[PDB]
Amino acid sequence: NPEVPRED
Amino acid sequence: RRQACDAILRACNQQLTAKLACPRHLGSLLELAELACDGYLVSTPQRPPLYLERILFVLLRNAAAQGSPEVTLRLAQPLHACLVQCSREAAPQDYEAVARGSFSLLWKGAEALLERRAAFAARLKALSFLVLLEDESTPCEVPHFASPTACRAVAAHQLFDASGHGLNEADADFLDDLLSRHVIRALVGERGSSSGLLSPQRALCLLELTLEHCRRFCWSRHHDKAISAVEKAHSYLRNTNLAPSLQLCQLGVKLLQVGEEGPQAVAKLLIKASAVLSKSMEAPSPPLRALYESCQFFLSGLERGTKRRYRLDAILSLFAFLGGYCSLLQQLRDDGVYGGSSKQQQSFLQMYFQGLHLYTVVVYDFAQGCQIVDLADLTQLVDSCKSTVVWMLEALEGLSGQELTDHMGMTASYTSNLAYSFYSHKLYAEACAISEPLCQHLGLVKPGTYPEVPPEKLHRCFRLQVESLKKLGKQAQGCKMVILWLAALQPCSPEHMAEPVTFWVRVKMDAARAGDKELQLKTLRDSLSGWDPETLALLLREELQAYKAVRADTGQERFNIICDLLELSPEETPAGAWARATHLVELAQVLCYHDFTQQTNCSALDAIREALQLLDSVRPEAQARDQLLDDKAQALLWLYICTLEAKMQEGIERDRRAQFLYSNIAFNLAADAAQSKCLDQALALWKELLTKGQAPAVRCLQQTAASLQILAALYQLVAKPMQALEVLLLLRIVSERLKDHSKAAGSSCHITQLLLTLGCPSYAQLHLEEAASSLKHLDQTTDTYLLLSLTCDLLRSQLYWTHQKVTKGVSLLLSVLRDPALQKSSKAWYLLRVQVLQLVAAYLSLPSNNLSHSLWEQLCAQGWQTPEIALIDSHKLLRSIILLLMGSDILSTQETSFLDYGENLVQKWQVLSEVLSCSEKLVCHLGRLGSVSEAKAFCLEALKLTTKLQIPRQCALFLVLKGELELARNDIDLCQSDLQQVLFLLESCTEIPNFLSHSPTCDCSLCASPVLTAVCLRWVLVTAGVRLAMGHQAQGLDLLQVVLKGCPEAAERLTQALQASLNHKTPPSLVPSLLDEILAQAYTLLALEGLNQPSNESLQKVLQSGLKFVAARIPHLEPWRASLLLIWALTKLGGLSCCTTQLFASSWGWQPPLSTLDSICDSLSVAFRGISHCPPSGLYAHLCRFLALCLGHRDPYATAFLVTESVSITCRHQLLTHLHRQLSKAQKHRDVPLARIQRLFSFRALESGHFPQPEKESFQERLALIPSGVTVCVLALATLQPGTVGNTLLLTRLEKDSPPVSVQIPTGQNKLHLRSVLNEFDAIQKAQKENSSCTDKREWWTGRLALDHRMEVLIASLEKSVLGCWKGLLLPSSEEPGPAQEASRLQELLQDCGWKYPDRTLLKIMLSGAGALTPQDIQALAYGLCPTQPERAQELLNEAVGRLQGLTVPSNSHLVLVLDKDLQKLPWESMPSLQALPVTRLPSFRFLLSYSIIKEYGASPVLSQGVDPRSTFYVLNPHNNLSSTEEQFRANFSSEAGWRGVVGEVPRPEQVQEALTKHDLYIYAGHGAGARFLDGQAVLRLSCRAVALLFGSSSAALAVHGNLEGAGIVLKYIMAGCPLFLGNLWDVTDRDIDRYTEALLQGWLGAGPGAPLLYYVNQARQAPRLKYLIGAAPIAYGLPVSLR
Ligand SMILES: [Zn+2]
């Protein structure tokens, strides 16, 4: 499952 | 008998009458006739019918015909006795012919004989007969004495000594002998007949004679004889009607005889003196003339005795006599005998005024000599003073003509001197009373009756009263007296009316300040009602001018005055139209800077437009053409001002509503040129007025000068400096015509400053001398003098700076800086300080060779260390002035009135212009230094300011600067957009661009303006840069050729324009230098392309052309000279590619397994000395690393210093600026650690010497400062072509008490070079970003796994293919003594195999890691170190490592990695050799020394004590984007003991500030680095006590844009003092970084006290599923940190 990046 | 003898005598008289050839015979016959006369006398001396007397008279006539006075005197010798015996009466005219005619004969005889003594004695006997029968003679006139007999005696004294200085004792006796025995005896008579006293006529003669004798004797220094003479008359003074006369004469003769004695003496005689006069007038028939003549003598005693010998009682005693004397004179005036012939009556009045003239003089004498205790005496004299003025005005009653005019003239003087005395000794109340009767008479008199009394006398008499009333508190009565002052001068010119008008406004303004409004209610119109309309209008205009002169708030007063004036002026008449237009211009000003439209229904623009139309409809006469010019010019100027004010207010609301870069189109319209046309027309009118030789006929030239000042300031704001120059020249002309030397000096100073800004120092020098000349006519106590002298000193300092006289210029600048007057709290002083700061920056931008070391310390000791600091302080002061003048609306749009009082108007536009100029300087300097972000901040602020004002020219300038900055950032799209905006502004200001292909001699807007020409050339430069960045070569080169052509051509146009404007004969000696920075930059860019294209021969000669240009202008274009020298050195090195041996090889002791170099070192040393003081980052780094390469191991310390000084230069500049801000607030609140850090990061803290001796000494001290146990390794890339990435690694190992060790590692020779590694890293990041978006889970995971494997391969390559054998330089040193001994042994044996530069320290360092020294590492080392005989060296090395293996163990220590902008990206900490070691990163070595300083003074609490685990602040899931992170971390974070923080909310900026300043740990488990709630500025404004554990994406990364040093938030944390900063080098995914964070926190916190964070950082690195893609991301910045 794709993980969201820790960015804005 | 006797009759017969008389008949014979008559015949003898005829015989004696003949004076022919026988005159001696006739004289002999006359002698016989005298005997015959004696014989006749025996019978009868004189016939009863006086026949003998008639015969004697005939004989006397015969003697007169024959000129025989002596014979006649003998003949008439017994006549007095014969007349005395004659008695009877009826003496005829013949009696006079024989007696008075004898005196007449004697008068002719006196006119004959040269001598006087004998002749005067004969005349005295003749005088005894001249008026002998005067008992019934007619009275004499009254310019003379009482009787003719005494008048004769005075006449003889006239022939005597006329000077009357002294009388000889013998002369006094001889002179007395004549009158006493001949004249006095005859009048007295031997038969005195005591029964019959002297007859009335006889008595008057007797006293008159005594006075004349005493007056002549006393005046001619003789008093003793007169004392006896008075006694003789006093002897016969039994009783008489003229008795008082001689008693008063006795007192007079006494007074001169007493002379200077005890004080009471003067009073005692004066006391008796009053009694004699007073009682005599009481008599029913007083001797009027007797008292009069006698009193005049007594007055002389005082007038000759007026030697300041006066007391209080003397003056009152004088007033007693003075008053009685006045009664006598007016009483004589009553008598009408002299009333008919006013000739004598006028003499009586002159005597009255002489009597009063004495009183005024005596009082002024007393007044001057008065002390505090004496003021009581001065007060008692008031009532006496009051009566004096009353008598004088009463005396004038009836006088007409010059008698009226003159005698009014005294009464004005006499009261004025009396009032001045009281005004002088602080007696205001009494002064008004003395001048009141005169003041009211002068006002009430029908205007014109007194048309000749000097205006000054009237002005003085009135001024004393108005001032006295003003200071007592009587402001109400003062205004009425002012009207009386104007009333008296009703028939007078307007010039005299100025002073009453000035006093009116002052009295009313003080009244208003006192709180009174009733006085304010009254205006001149109502009080002056009854005067003619024209004079009332003139007075109202003067009152308006006086109101415009005063400061503070006067808007509504001027509005009321303008309303009254407009009502008075009749609009139906053209003259009324002109007056209405002028008053409408005044109303336009008032409505322009106030809000009274609620009372007029008219705006400022409507009023000024109606004024302009009315003025256009005025056809003037022959004269009045000048006044019309002035009025129309002022109207045009104020129309411009009001339009600009409306535009500014509309812009304020535009921003307020919006609260851009879209309004740029709104700026430049046809309205811009239409608006500037008004200023052009005003200038044309003023030039036409003030150029012609004749002095202008304007009502107010001061207003013309002030308007000229306002026009010049507006022209500089709109960026039209030549027009401002013309206006300043006109101001100089006006100031010369107005005799104002302050204005002349200020104007000349402004011209000098303008000429210096343009770049022409000669014309500037000429204007500085005119200013110095004008300054010598001013009171040196005035602040204007001090200001102008300090300004002239600054201008002379700047001229010395320009003409390379730096030593004396620095001395002058230090004298100005140290002057206490520069710190005075006034707006003009603030404006002076700004130019001081700019000149300080000018001196601070100079190379160290220009000035001595001592003067450099003296200049830096003032407070500013870098030019940027001085410029920033100047900008801050300018903003403060703007705030103090016009609020904050023009600067920010988040209420104070403008308060226009003349100076504020000029200062407003001046300060706006200086803000824009200082912004330009700051932007240029900061962009040149490589600090693009700050420059962009200033550029945006200036663009906003020019947006509000709507000035297209300044907008174009700042848009070009912004385009240059965006090119520096490598942002091509935004730069192109800015350039296109510039193109539109330029094309619509003049109405491939069209301003190119213009004639060299062109007169268009873009060619007649230096500013627009500069903007065009900068545009071409930035466009060429864009073209070259986009790969379009030979187009950017074409544009650079255009720039090269354009700059010298434009300089000549400016030269010609300046010469034609100032009308100098010779041209400026040297062409101005303002486009020389543009030409130098073009030269630099063209030479750098020649480097890229070595074949183009054209570019090859450009390096020599540019170097000669920059060498001709030392030291002003030094940074460009340094760049050109670097390019020359690179050209001489040869091919910059191919990775050959390179000339540097000989200078290095290891190779991968005069001379040209001497010349290169010299050139590079010169360039380094050029830029060492204030270096641009990239150029400095290039020079430093190239010179380190060239120097090699020929000088280890120079190489290490050069490598150290090439890293993080922009951070050094920013730290210096930040430190200055900290010290400034420290001074404001109220520093030693701050001073030491300034001295550590400073560029000028060097001693004098030759390169590199002072640099090496500074480096040696900084190396002595290193702490123990720390290893500093600098990894820099040596770039052999600017704008590229080098493949040579410079490695410097710095340690305490060990010599520096350096090494060069060329990586181009091998595959997997440094460029390949960086390219692979960037590709990995790109692929990660692409994969993040994908939605298919399997593809996402597979791509992530591939990226992790790529990261592992890159990390392995870093250790094996880049550092190779030198990896051991980063490892700690051994404490065991084995490696030192082995190095000592091997050094000599290695030197015998060909080791060129034997270094024991390098051998020690490499032998410490003996265990991990692979056989291949040994082979590389031995083969590259001893190339002559490699195998023997390999054997020796293998033997040494065999002896050292196992027997050595690494120790506790710390590795600080200093990396450049390109290498900081790579994850060096994850290399397999560095996995088990504690490693952190610092921006530079000076930062490690700074950390040591802060820790010594106890400012870093966590680096001194430790991290408290209970002082943590966490920001979790602030934006509600991540639900998994919250679920994982919420329970752990909240259950932690003592931890506070937030979740699900953006923490208020106040919360993060307290977190960073008051806690020891800060954890951000969110997106990015948290720049949304805490930006770099906020963290920079605070001191960071806590350890920042930032777990976002790219938190520790530095962004490299173009060729600029990396920027980021971590740098701000380090500069704030963060003990340690943990962050992600690249972007991460949520769950993996969650596992890393959990592992790190659990491992560190569970460890307990004394737990190094770095150990658990590398252990937490093994937690994620993606080991290298996520674990390798976190890095540390700072120094190691533990738990307490
Ligand atoms: Zn042109």
Q: Is B495 helix (H, G, I), strand (E, B) or coil?
A: coil
**Torsions phi, psi for B1628 (to 5 deg):** -130, 165
Question: In this structure, are strands B1270-1278 and B1288-1294 parallel, antiparallel, or unpaired?
Answer: antiparallel
**Is the CB of residue B956 less than 8 Å from the CB of residue B1005?**
no
A6: which chain B residues are within 8 Å (Cβ-Cβ)?
1522, 1566-1568, 1591-1593, 1624, 1627-1630, 1633
* Cis geometry, peptide bond prior to residue B1252 (ω within 30 degrees of 0): yes
By Cβ distance, the residue of A1, A5, A8 closest to B1332 is A5
Cα of B1340 to nearest chain A Cα, Å? 6
**Is the CB of residue B179 less than 8 Å from the CB of residue B213?**
yes
Closest to B1661 (Cα-Cα) out of B1530, B1527, B1477: B1477
Under an 8 A CB cutoff, do A4 and B1522 touch?
Answer: yes
Q: Exposure of B1103 by Cβ count < 10 A (0-12 exposed, 13-18 middle, 19+ buried)?
A: buried
- Cα distance between residue B1384 and residue B1382, in whole Å: 5
A 10 A CB-CB count for B460 gives: 17
**Is the CB of residue B323 less than 8 Å from the CB of residue B356?**
no
Kindly provide the resolution of this structure in angstroms, with one decimal. Answer: 2.8
User: Considering only alpha carbons, which residue of chain B is nearest residue A6?
Assistant: B1567
Q: Is B72 helix (H, G, I), strand (E, B) or coil?
A: helix
- Cα distance between residue B869 and residue B863, in whole Å: 9
B1629: which chain A residues are within 8 Å (Cβ-Cβ)?
3-6
The enclosing H or E element of B1389 equals: helix B1378-1391
**Is the CB of residue B1403 less than 8 Å from the CB of residue B1383?**
yes
**Is the CB of residue B1470 less than 8 Å from the CB of residue B1354?**
no
Length of chain B: 1684
- Cα distance between residue B1297 and residue B1094, in whole Å: 47
- Cα distance between residue B1479 and residue B593, in whole Å: 66
Beta-bridge mates of residue A5: B1629
Question: In this structure, are strands B1454-1459 and B1479-1481 parallel, antiparallel, or unpaired?
Answer: parallel
What angle in degrees, to the nearest 10, is found between the helix axes of B100-112 and B51-66? 10
- Cα distance between residue B942 and residue B963, in whole Å: 14
Closest to B98 (Cα-Cα) out of B126, B123, B139: B126
Cα B1067 to ligand 1 centroid, rounded to whole Å? 23
Q: Which tokens is B129 given?
A: 């007969």
User: Considering only alpha carbons, which residue of chain A is nearest residue B1571?
Assistant: A8
**Torsions phi, psi for B674 (to 5 deg):** -60, -35
Residue to substitute from B1631, B1635, B1665, B1669, interface A, most A β-carbons within 10 A: B1631
Cα B1053 to ligand 1 centroid, rounded to whole Å? 11
DSSP type of residue B896: -
Classify B1467 in phi/psi space as left (phi over 0), alpha (psi -120 to 50) or beta: beta
* Cis geometry, peptide bond prior to residue B1115 (ω within 30 degrees of 0): yes
By Cβ distance, the residue of A1, A5, A8 closest to B1337 is A1
- DSSP labels for B1084-1147? HHHHHHHHH-TT-HHHHHHHHHHHHHHHTTTTTSHHHHHHHHHHHHHHHH--SSTT---GGGGG
Q: Which tokens is B1650 given?
A: 């004394």
- Cα distance between residue B1137 and residue B1127, in whole Å: 15
Closest to B74 (Cα-Cα) out of B118, B129, B121, B34: B34
Rg (CA), chain B: 55
Breaks (C-N over 2.5 A) in chain B follow: 659, 894, 991, 1153, 1230
Residue to substitute from B1573, B1628, B1637, interface A, most A β-carbons within 10 A: B1628
Q: Which residues contact B1508 (CB under 8 A, 6 or more apart)?
A: B1560, B1561, B1684
Helices (H), B179-287: 185-188, 200-219, 224-235, 243-258, 263-282
Structure-token match 């190396």, residue found:
B1263
Q: Which tokens is B325 given?
A: 């004397």
Q: Which residues contact B158 (CB under 8 A, 6 or more apart)?
A: none
Query: What are the angstrom distances between the C-alpha of B1491 and each of B970, B1235, B1495?
Result: 34, 14, 6
Under an 8 A CB cutoff, do A3 and B1629 touch?
Answer: yes
B1633: which chain A residues are within 8 Å (Cβ-Cβ)?
6
Which long-range contacts link B1429-1435 to residues 24+ away (Cβ below 8 Å)?
Answer: B1429/B1393, B1429/B1394, B1430/B1153, B1430/B1393, B1432/B1393, B1433/B1390, B1433/B1393, B1433/B1395
The enclosing H or E element of B339 equals: helix B337-340
**Is the CB of residue B763 less than 8 Å from the CB of residue B755?**
yes
Length of chain A: 8
Q: Which residues contact B652 (CB under 8 A, 6 or more apart)?
A: B889, B890, B893, B948
Which amino acid type is present at position B747?
S
Cα B990 to ligand 1 centroid, rounded to whole Å? 9
The enclosing H or E element of B1278 equals: strand B1270-1278
Cα of A5 to nearest chain B Cα, Å? 4
- Cα distance between residue B872 and residue B864, in whole Å: 10
- Cα distance between residue B135 and residue B202, in whole Å: 5
Cα B1045 to ligand 1 centroid, rounded to whole Å? 15
Cα B962 to ligand 1 centroid, rounded to whole Å? 25
Helices (H), B99-223: 100-112, 117-130, 148-159, 169-178, 185-188, 200-219
User: Considering only alpha carbons, which residue of chain B is nearest residue A8?
Assistant: B1567
- Cα distance between residue B1370 and residue B1406, in whole Å: 10
Closest to B1033 (Cα-Cα) out of B979, B962, B1100, B1085: B1085
DSSP type of residue B1277: E
Q: Convert B358-367 to b/e letters by CB count within 10 Å (16 or more is b).
A: bbbebbbbbb
Q: Which tokens is B612 given?
A: 């302009």
By Cβ distance, the residue of A1, A2, A7 closest to B1567 is A7
Q: What is the 3-state secondary structure (H, E, C) of B1324-1338?
A: HHHHHHHHHHCCCHH
Query: What are the angstrom distances between the C-alpha of B1139 and each of B1129, B1283, B1318, B1321?
Result: 17, 18, 19, 23
B1609: which chain A residues are within 8 Å (Cβ-Cβ)?
none
Closest to B923 (Cα-Cα) out of B984, B893, B879, B966: B966
What angle in degrees, to the nearest 10, is found between the helix axes of B100-112 and B117-130? 160
Cα B1057 to ligand 1 centroid, rounded to whole Å? 14
- Cα distance between residue B1564 and residue B1562, in whole Å: 7
Experimental method: cryo-EM
Q: How far is CA B1467 from the centre of its chain?
A: 58
Beta-bridge mates of residue B1599: B1607
Under an 8 A CB cutoff, do B1630 and A1 touch?
Answer: no
Q: Convert B1052-1086 to b/e letters by CB count within 10 Å (16 or more is b).
A: ebbbebbbeebeeeeebeebbbbbbbbbbbbbbbb
Q: How far is CA B382 from the centre of its chain?
A: 48
Q: Is B105 helix (H, G, I), strand (E, B) or coil?
A: helix
Tally A–B CB contacts below 8 A. Answer: 44
Under an 8 A CB cutoff, do B1340 and A2 touch?
Answer: yes
- Cα distance between residue B956 and residue B950, in whole Å: 11
Ligand 1 being an ion, which residues bring their Cβ within 5 A of it?
B 998, 1002, 1004, 1007
Q: Convert B137-156 to b/e letters by CB count within 10 Å (16 or more is b).
A: eeebebebbbbbbbbbbbbb
Under an 8 A CB cutoff, do A3 and B1337 touch?
Answer: no
Classify B168 in phi/psi space as left (phi over 0), alpha (psi -120 to 50) or beta: beta
Cα B951 to ligand 1 centroid, rounded to whole Å? 20
Q: Which tokens is B648 given?
A: 């500014």
**Is the CB of residue B670 less than 8 Å from the CB of residue B743?**
no
Structure-token match 């930032």, residue found:
B1590
User: Considering only alpha carbons, which residue of chain A is nearest residue B1572?
Assistant: A8
- Cα distance between residue B1278 and residue B1183, in whole Å: 10
Q: Which tokens is B141 given?
A: 């006139």
Closest to B1678 (Cα-Cα) out of B1608, B1590, B1587, B1558: B1587
Q: Exposure of B1527 by Cβ count < 10 A (0-12 exposed, 13-18 middle, 19+ buried)?
A: exposed
**Is the CB of residue B221 less than 8 Å from the CB of residue B228?**
no
**Given CA atoms B434, B436, B437, B442 in this order, what sign does their dihedral have?**
positive
User: Considering only alpha carbons, which residue of chain A is nearest residue B1340?
Assistant: A2
Beta-bridge mates of residue B531: B529
Q: Which tokens is B1323 given?
A: 């590709």
Q: Exposure of B955 by Cβ count < 10 A (0-12 exposed, 13-18 middle, 19+ buried)?
A: buried
Closest to B1596 (Cα-Cα) out of B1628, B1643, B1632, B1553: B1628
Q: Which residues contact B1108 (CB under 8 A, 6 or more apart)?
A: none
Cα B994 to ligand 1 centroid, rounded to whole Å? 9
Which amino acid type is present at position B176?
D
Classify B311 in phi/psi space as left (phi over 0), alpha (psi -120 to 50) or beta: beta
- Cα distance between residue B1295 and residue B1628, in whole Å: 36
- Cα distance between residue B1597 and residue B1575, in whole Å: 15
Under an 8 A CB cutoff, do A5 and B1629 touch?
Answer: yes
**Is the CB of residue B1565 less than 8 Å from the CB of residue B1515?**
yes
Cα B998 to ligand 1 centroid, rounded to whole Å? 5
Helices (H), B845-930: 853-860, 867-886, 903-929
How many helices and strands, by DSSP H and E, does chain A display? Answer: 0, 0
**Is the CB of residue B489 less than 8 Å from the CB of residue B497?**
yes
The domain ranges of chain B are: 1-98, 951-1074, 1078-1264, 1314-1454, 1500-1678
Helices (H), B1559-1671: 1576-1580, 1609-1616, 1630-1647, 1653-1660
Q: Which residues contact B154 (CB under 8 A, 6 or more apart)?
A: B144, B145, B212, B216
Strand segments (E) across B715-794 = none
Which amino acid type is present at position B1662?
Q
Rounded (5°) CA angle B363-B368-B374: 85
Residue to substitute from B1630, B1665, B1669, interface A, most A β-carbons within 10 A: B1630
Residue to substitute from A6, A7, A8, interface B, most B β-carbons within 10 A: A6
Rounded (5°) CA angle B697-B701-B705: 135
A 10 A CB-CB count for B1036 gives: 23
Residue to substitute from B1335, B1336, B1563, B1567, interface A, most A β-carbons within 10 A: B1567
Cα of A8 to nearest chain B Cα, Å? 6
Q: What is the 3-state secondary structure (H, E, C) of B415-474?
A: HHHHHHHHHHCCCHHHHHHHHHHHHHHHHHCCCCCCCCCCHHHHHHHHHHHHHHHHHHCC
Beta-bridge mates of residue B1455: B1271, B1479
Strand segments (E) across B1360-1411 = none
Which amino acid type is present at position B1220?
H
CATH architecture of B1500-1678: 3-Layer(aba) Sandwich (3.40)
Q: Which residues contact B725 (CB under 8 A, 6 or more apart)?
A: B751, B754, B755, B1061, B1062
User: Considering only alpha carbons, which residue of chain A is nearest residue B1329?
Assistant: A5
Closest to B864 (Cα-Cα) out of B1219, B1220, B1174, B1218: B1220
Q: Is B1481 helix (H, G, I), strand (E, B) or coil?
A: strand
Structure-token match 């509600």, residue found:
B1520
A 10 A CB-CB count for B1372 gives: 20
Q: How far is CA B1354 from the centre of its chain?
A: 65
Q: Which tokens is B1678 given?
A: 């700072």
Rounded (5°) CA angle B1560-B1564-B1568: 135
Query: What are the angstrom distances between the C-alpha of B1601 and each of B356, B375, B403, B933, B1604?
Result: 97, 85, 97, 11, 6
- Cα distance between residue B344 and residue B321, in whole Å: 23
**Is the CB of residue B549 less than 8 Å from the CB of residue B902?**
yes
- Cα distance between residue B125 and residue B138, in whole Å: 22
- Cα distance between residue B55 and residue B46, in whole Å: 10
A2: which chain B residues are within 8 Å (Cβ-Cβ)?
1332, 1334-1335, 1337, 1340
- Cα distance between residue B329 and residue B345, in whole Å: 10
The chain B residues in contact with chain A (CB within 8 A) are 1332, 1334-1335, 1337, 1340, 1519, 1521-1522, 1566-1568, 1572, 1591-1594, 1624, 1627-1633
- Cα distance between residue B54 and residue B97, in whole Å: 9
User: Considering only alpha carbons, which residue of chain B is nearest residue A2?
Assistant: B1337
Q: Exposure of B1034 by Cβ count < 10 A (0-12 exposed, 13-18 middle, 19+ buried)?
A: exposed
Q: Is B1620 helix (H, G, I), strand (E, B) or coil?
A: strand
How many helices and strands, by DSSP H and E, does chain B display? Answer: 74, 11
- Cα distance between residue B1292 and residue B1197, in whole Å: 10
Under an 8 A CB cutoff, do A3 and B1632 touch?
Answer: yes
Query: What are the angstrom distances between the C-alpha of B1326 and each of B124, B1316, B1323, B1567, B1604?
Result: 142, 15, 5, 19, 21
